[PDB]
Design a protein around this ligand. Structure first.
Ligand SMILES: CCCCCCCCCO[C@@H]1O[C@H](CO)[C@@H](O)[C@H](O)[C@H]1O
Ligand SMILES: CCCCCCCCCO[C@@H]1O[C@H](CO)[C@@H](O)[C@H](O)[C@H]1O
Ligand SMILES: O=C(O)[C@H](O)[C@@H](O)[C@H](O)[C@H](O)CO
Length: 409
């Protein structure tokens, strides 16, 4: 029982990763207040992380390949942890963009190293449950830590939100460097436990032209719907990781302290949507259903749900705002599961490429919505932004139910 402890350390790093994404949403109001930047300029601050994140992913694969999984993880954690620690001492605007950008650099190869690690640390049948553990759990981490930082932000200056988050990361990097090592090079493991992995699957030792014809295939009536769909899934997720705290603070005039305890229900609602979707996956086909309709239904329904974010601007009651926000985020988590489906639509050759472009579509949804909300909220308040997301969600839903009636193989 040493195989899981690794998964526990990966889960912690996924949380620390997403805290350093949402840690800014906490201090958005104060940073904006102190530095006196405009809503639209703040939109560029939120986005700074997303730009390089998507760009520094195909270079992240290179660095990873030629540097390894262990060491590459330490450089990343330490890299962005230092970059996050100094987000607390930033002054002006340009200082923040660079730190957010740098954070996006070292945090971009986060997942690829995970997939390369769970591969060698767990068999095949335990892999789907392994990734679902730390991706589903990430929202639990944001649910309990987001009210904490806000409470720290309301007790201590917003800087300490970044000093804490950054300092912790600097410490976890050092922990990772010692404890972690491939299953083969992991003392305390069990002789039979390792054989289970090796015989079961995974590389316990470790992991060891372009024609424009593909472009025409990669861009398919079925695959565009997948891209526009993921673009919409990422649009909503990055709103909750950025503008959602300040939304309640400014638009609805909720006290940051109450808005800090109102944000732990939506992040938990996401944790359920993810799991409840993975359960409807097995469940449907189990009752004699095709696989395409089995995975399409959670995605389409969840995005049609997301349309409920629009309803929040028609009420000023916390519980009703907190209920509607929790239902939309549930739809996002319930419709989040795509790539494994997208892997079964691209040709056997382009499974690797589709990922990069497929995520780019997602990462593209995270670059747009912060600028859109920042620009919209600057001039017309936060009301015209929630209709955009409900729209996008409706386009992503229409884009999935019309453009993907069946699967290509
Ligand atoms: C004013 C901000 C300057 C940006 C600094 C962030 C990058 C740190 C540069 O050091 C190292 O350089 C190598 C290649 O140059 C990288 O492979 C490695 O990941 C990185 O750790
Ligand atoms: C650029 C920043 C990246 C943020 C990612 C937000 C969009 C999520 C991508 O969809 C993912 O599809 C997987 C298929 O298995 C699911 O398991 C997983 O739950 C889901 O998250
Ligand atoms: O699956 C996820 O959790 C992300 O959305 C991915 O799209 C990453 O951006 C990257 O592709 C890692 O594989």
């Amino acid at each position: 029982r040493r195989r899981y402890l690794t998964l526990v350390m990966i889960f912690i790093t996924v949380v620390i990763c997403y805290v350093d994404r949402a840690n800014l949403a906490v201090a958005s109001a104060h940073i904006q207040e102190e530095f006196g930047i405009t809503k639209a300029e703040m939109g560029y601050v939120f986005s700074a992380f997303a730009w390089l994140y998507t760009l520094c992913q195909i270079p992240g694969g290179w660095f990873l390949d030629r540097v390894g999984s262990r060491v590459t993880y330490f450089i990343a954690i330490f890299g962005w942890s230092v970059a996050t620690l100094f987000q607390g001492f930033a002054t002006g605007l340009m200082s923040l963009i660079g730190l957010r950008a740098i954070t996006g650099i070292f945090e971009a190869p986060a997942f690829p190293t995970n997939n390369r690690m769970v591969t060698s640390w767990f068999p095949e049948h335990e892999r789907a449950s392994a990734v679902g553990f730390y991706t589903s759990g990430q929202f639990v981490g944001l649910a309990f830590l987001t009210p904490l930082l806000i409470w720290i932000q309301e007790m201590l200056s917003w800087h300490w939100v970044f000093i804490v988050t950054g300092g912790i990361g600097i410490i976890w990097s050092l922990i990772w460097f010692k404890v972690y090592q491939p299953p083969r090079l992991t003392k305390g493991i069990s002789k039979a436990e390792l054989d289970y992995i090796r015989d079961g699957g995974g590389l316990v030792d470790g992991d060891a032209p372009l024609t424009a014809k593909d472009w025409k295939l990669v861009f398919h009536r079925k695959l565009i719907g997948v891209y526009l769909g993921q673009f919409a899934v990422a649009s909503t997720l990055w709103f909750f990781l950025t503008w959602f705290p300040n939304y309640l603070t400014q638009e609805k005039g909720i006290t940051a302290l109450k808005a800090g305890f109102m944000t732990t229900v939506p992040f938990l609602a996401a944790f359920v949507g993810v799991l409840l979707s993975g359960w409807v996956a097995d469940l449907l086909v189990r009752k004699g259903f095709s696989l395409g309709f089995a995975r399409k239904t959670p995605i389409i329904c969840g995005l049609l749900i997301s349309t409920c974010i629009m309803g929040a601007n028609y009420t000023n009651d916390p519980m009703m705002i907190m209920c509607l926000m929790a239902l939309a985020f549930f739809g996002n988590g319930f419709a989040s599961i795509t790539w494994s489906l997208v892997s079964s639509l691209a040709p056997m050759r382009l499974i690797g490429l589709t990922g990069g472009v497929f995520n780019f579509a997602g990462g593209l949804g995270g670059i747009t919505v912060p600028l859109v909300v920042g620009y919209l909220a600057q001039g017309y308040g936060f009301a015209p932004a929630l209709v955009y997301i409900s729209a996008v969600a409706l386009i992503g839903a229409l884009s999935y139910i019309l453009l993907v009636g069946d699967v290509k193989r």
